[PDB]
């Protein structure tokens, strides 16, 4: 059971996004103690944002990523109090110019909690 | 019989800082004290709540009026009056 989100009535959440261009996600040691990697991209969005929607915002910031065939691998980076540290969990991928089965995956469907980081490993075609 | 001046703010996202809380709730009155505890084993992170004490009960009432059910960083928050001395 999910609540529909009215984006004029619900204020957006701050999403802190990190990207690579070599197909590999950031190491966990780059996030220790509140440090973060270079090139943070700050997005304001909603819990029903989809991978396809987020991909277009990323393409807005990096036009080279627009090229047909570009692969976006999405991972959530999140503090797990159970282990004393950050963990990364890959959630899905999209590709420029292709319709894939993760296009419509949403943050909340993945149990994303606000404040968790998004890490996007991008592979040129 | 005297009315409370201290409020508990709940459901704060992991993005929300002590300064954000000062800035937002100062909208409703003069803040005399804030307590926003951090994760013991990860001090850079809050526990997701704060106490805010105002100078007078009218201000605390106002804050509760406007923000219990209000939103901070895209998430609905709780605001409730608290009658207790600071923790020991």
């Amino acid at each position: 059971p999910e609540k529909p989100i009215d984006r004029e009535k619900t204020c957006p959440l701050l999403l802190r996004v990190f990207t690579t261009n070599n197909g590999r996600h950031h190491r966990m040691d780059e996030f220790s103690r509140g440090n973060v990697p270079s090139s943070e991209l700050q997005i304001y969005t909603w819990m029903d944002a989809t991978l396809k929607e987020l991909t277009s915002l990323v393409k807005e910031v990096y036009p080279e990523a627009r090229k047909k065939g570009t692969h976006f691998n999405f991972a959530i980076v999140f503090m797990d109090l159970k282990r004393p540290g950050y963990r990364v969990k890959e959630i899905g991928s999209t590709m420029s110019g292709r319709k894939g089965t993760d296009d419509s995956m949403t943050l909340q469907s993945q149990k994303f909690q606000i404040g968790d980081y998004l890490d996007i490993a991008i592979t040129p075609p | 019989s005297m009315k409370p001046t201290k409020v508990h703010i709940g459901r704060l996202t992991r993005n929300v800082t002590k300064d954000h809380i000062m800035e937002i709730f100062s909208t409703y009155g003069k803040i005399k004290m804030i307590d926003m505890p951090v994760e013991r084993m990860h001090p850079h992170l809050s526990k997701g709540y704060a106490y805010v004490e105002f100078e007078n009960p009218d201000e605390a009432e106002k804050a509760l009026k406007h923000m219990d059910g209000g939103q901070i960083d895209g998430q609905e928050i709780t605001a409730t009056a608290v009658l207790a001395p600071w923790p020991r």
Binding site: E8, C11, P12, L14 | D19, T27, D68, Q71, D73
Partner: peptide, 27 residues
């Protein structure tokens, strides 16, 4: 448009917030 709809902090990183509508408080 976001800045018309929602309040934004000066403190960083900047976050948006929003109190209950006058409507909602009375109701």
């Amino acid at each position: 448009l976001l800045d018309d709809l929602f309040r934004k902090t000066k403190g960083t990183p900047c976050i948006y917030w929003l109190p209950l509508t006058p409507e909602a408080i009375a109701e």
